[PDB]
Design a protein around this ligand. Structure first.
Ligand SMILES: O=C(N[C@H]1COC(=O)[C@@H](NC(=O)c2cccc(O)c2O)COC(=O)[C@@H](NC(=O)c2cccc(O)c2O)COC1=O)c1cccc(O)c1O
Ligand SMILES: [Fe+3]
Length: 698
């Protein structure tokens, strides 16, 4: 099946029948347990939603490509409210060159370590065969409303041998998603008066992609395989007015329709793969270098995350990420039949950010231990990791899998992430799964850095209206989560029915602090001697919910599939406010008709449950008026087909959002001075959209 308890596979065939515009988040998000959310509840950068597993937020969703981490979003400033001006890390690999996507949720994911507390998404690429194969894929959509940005996508692939013991695979992608019109939210915006009269919450950012990958596989012996690959990708945006607080100035307007951020992502990887009688061996070296070039933004209050007109022009943040991994796999014949895996991991994150550490102390007064100008640009962390998995068969059908992961973070210290996963054949048709693990989150290099300094004159300060600083804190503990899950699945002759309960107990969630630790000295007028908050560890939080799947073969030619997410609870146990904003539930429903040998037809519906905003503003006080707005449940329906013209040529065509259900970003969730809040109404849902596709392959 494509759905076991805790796990989902998306195949190449699935990608082709529900083609994504551009980014894979579109299809990844239809798996059980998966939402498309921001990281916290501000609604800041709310059209920049990313993959969330079990409401643990997208910082706790680890993206791999062929088992190798993507860290590129770690190059974008992490803001006061736990959001980056980032589109996330699911748009580096082009849809049509993906063989399959693996989603691993909760206790089964903890064994991957740092940032898998929600889960792992592993995007797997198509590889060389015994012969040469290749493809040319093109997709083009056509929105009903011209405001909304159309998408165009062209990707090739080409793989095969060179010698009897040398293989290669290459691909390249060129794609563009046009931005929404600067004015798409006009007449839908929250009430904006005084200085902020005229301001707009923005529609979806556009992006231009250029992806090129080369791989050489070398199997110099029957038992021994050696892979070298390099990756070059480039995303440039099309700016449509997006700003942290939905405030505007003249620089912002100058940049409507222009590239204001570019990400270059370069990966080189060496991978050796061993298979001999004693068992299996795998080790890799990845060097990921990300250049995040964007227009300077301010770091104070309502100037946080708007283009700074006094310091016009681009800066470039640089992320050098180094990953090396070793594992072996030992069949053991013992008093119980089992398979043992032993592994080290080593990672280094260097971050050079020439912008984020430039907030100065002239207004709020100076901060003992923090230089007011020319602070370091530099951050780094090394994690060393050892782990073993023991995959024990107690009696045929049953598996017990205990694993220990230990990590040395060179700042935060030692972490112990133990795990245990049971699966039980009760019947040849019914399987019970239970799992309890403690997953791991190392603080990000922004949270961790005492040189990283934000300021507010009050409006953003917890439990007061006075000026305050927020400061990085190298004293922070790692976030840990005891991810529990209990689940049952019936499977027999493509009849699949399964339901999982999950509870993640969340300890030391890192977040802008609630109490001043200190007070600065000096500065100007009423703002002088500002309060100092740090990034704190929140003692306790909880997420809880249900994952369901049901697959019925109506007839031979015809398959009815459903995936269900239901979010029971999401609670910061300190403040009692929500962690994420998700829909209460999500049901994805596909009907797949194999109408002919050659013609396949697809109907889909997605139902989103109610969405409620945060109860408390940045002060910790209760929000009022349009800050309380909720989004009603709504559904999006679609038809598509694929008509195979030959072994060499297939055509696709369809319609997303048949009944043109549309939603509009009204702004951020809470009121500020002159900008009423928009509650849960923080993103744009696109309208009816026709799409066509063509795939030629040998
Ligand atoms: O969303 C926030 N602002 C809005 C709304 O804020 C306002 O409209 C005013 N604002 C306050 O009255 C305020 C009264 C008491 C305390 C304030 O902080 C006020 O801002 C004026 O500030 C501004 O116009 C700008 N602002 C600064 O230049 C600033 C410079 C340095 C330091 C600042 O604090 C600044 O605001 C932009 O502010 C905005 O657009 C916002 C969020 C998070 C934290 C904030 O502080 C925000 O203000
Ligand atoms: Fe302010």
């Amino acid at each position: 099946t494509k759905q076991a308890p805790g796990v989902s596979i998306i195949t190449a065939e699935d990608i082709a029948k529900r083609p994504p515009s551009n980014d894979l988040s579109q299809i990844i998000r239809t798996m059980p347990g998966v939402n498309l959310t921001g990281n916290s509840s501000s609604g800041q950068r709310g059209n920049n939603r990313q993959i969330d597993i079990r409401g643990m937020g997208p910082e706790n969703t680890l993206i791999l490509v062929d088992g190798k981490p993507v860290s590129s979003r770690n190059s974008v400033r992490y803001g006061w409210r736990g959001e980056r001006d980032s589109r996330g890390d699911t748009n580096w690999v082009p849809a049509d060159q993906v063989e399959r996507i693996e989603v691993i949720r909760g206790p089964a994911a903890a064994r991957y370590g740092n940032g898998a507390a929600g889960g792992v998404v592993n995007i797997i690429t198509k590889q060389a065969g015994a012969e040469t194969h290749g493809n040319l894929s093109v997709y083009s959509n056509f929105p009903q409303h011209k405001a909304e940005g159309a998408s165009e996508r062209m990707s090739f692939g080409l793989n095969g041998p060179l010698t009897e013991n040398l293989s290669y695979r290459v691909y390249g992608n060129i794609a563009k998603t046009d931005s929404d019109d600067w004015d798409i939210n006009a007449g839908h915006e929250s009430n904006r008066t005084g200085k902020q009269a005229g301001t707009l919450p923005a529609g979806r950012e556009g992006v231009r992609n250029k992806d090129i990958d080369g791989l050489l596989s070398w199997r110099l012996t029957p038992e021994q395989t050696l892979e070298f690959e390099a990756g070059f990708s480039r995303q440039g945006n099309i700016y449509t007015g997006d700003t942290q607080n939905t405030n505007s100035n003249n620089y912002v307007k100058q940049m409507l329709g222009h590239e204001t951020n570019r990400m270059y992502r370069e990966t080189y990887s060496v991978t050796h793969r061993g298979e001999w009688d004693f068992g299996s061996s795998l080790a890799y070296l990845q060097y990921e270098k990300t250049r995040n070039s964007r227009i300077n933004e301010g770091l104070a209050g309502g100037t946080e995350g708007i283009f700074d007109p006094n310091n016009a022009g681009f800066y470039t943040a640089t992320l050098r990420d180094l990953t090396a991994h070793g594992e072996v796999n030992l069949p053991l014949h013992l008093g119980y039949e089992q398979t043992l895996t032993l592994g080290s991991e080593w990672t280094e994150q260097k971050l050079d950010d020439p912008s984020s550490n430039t907030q100065n102390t002239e207004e709020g007064g100076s901060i003992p231990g923090l230089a007011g100008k020319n602070r370091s640009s530099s951050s780094s962390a090394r994690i060393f990791s050892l782990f073993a998995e023991d995959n024990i068969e107690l009696m045929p059908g049953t598996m017990l899998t205990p694993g220990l992961r230990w990590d040395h973070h060179d700042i935060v210290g030692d972490n112990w992430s133990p795990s245990l996963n049971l699966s039980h054949a009760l019947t040849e048709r019914v399987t019970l799964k239970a799992g309890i693990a403690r997953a791991y989150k190392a603080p990000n290099l922004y949270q961790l850095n005492p040189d990283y300094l934000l300021y507010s004159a009050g409006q953003g300060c917890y439990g007061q209206s006075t000026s305050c600083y927020l400061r990085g804190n190298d004293g922070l503990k790692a976030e840990t989560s005891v991810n529990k899950e209990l689940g049952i699945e019936y499977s027999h002759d493509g009849l699949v029915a399964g339901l999982t309960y999950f509870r993640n107990d969340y300890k030391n969630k890192i977040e802008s602090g609630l109490s001043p630790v200190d007070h600065a000295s000096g500065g100007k007028g009423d703002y002088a001697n500002a309060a100092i908050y740090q990034w704190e560890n929140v003692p306790k939080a909880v997420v809880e919910g249900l994952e369901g799947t049901l697959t019925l073969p109506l007839a031979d030619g015809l398959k009815w599939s459903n995936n269900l997410t239901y979010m029971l609870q999401s609670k910061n146990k300190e403040t009692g406010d929500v962690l994420s904003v998700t829909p209460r539930y999500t049901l994805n429903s596909m009907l797949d008709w194999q109408a002919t040998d050659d013609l396949s037809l697809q109907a889909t519906v997605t139902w989103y449950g109610k969405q409620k905003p945060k109860k408390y503003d940045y002060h910790g006080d209760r929000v009022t008026g349009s800050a309380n707005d909720q989004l009603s449940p709504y559904a999006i329906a679609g038809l598509g087909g694929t008509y195979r013209l030959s072994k060499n040529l297939s055509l696709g065509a369809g319609v997303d959002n048949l009944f043109d259900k549309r939603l509009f970003r009204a702004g951020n969730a809470q009121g500020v001075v002159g900008i009423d809040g928009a509650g849960a109404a923080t993103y744009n849902e696109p309208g009816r959209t026709f799409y066509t596709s063509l795939t030629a392959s040998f």
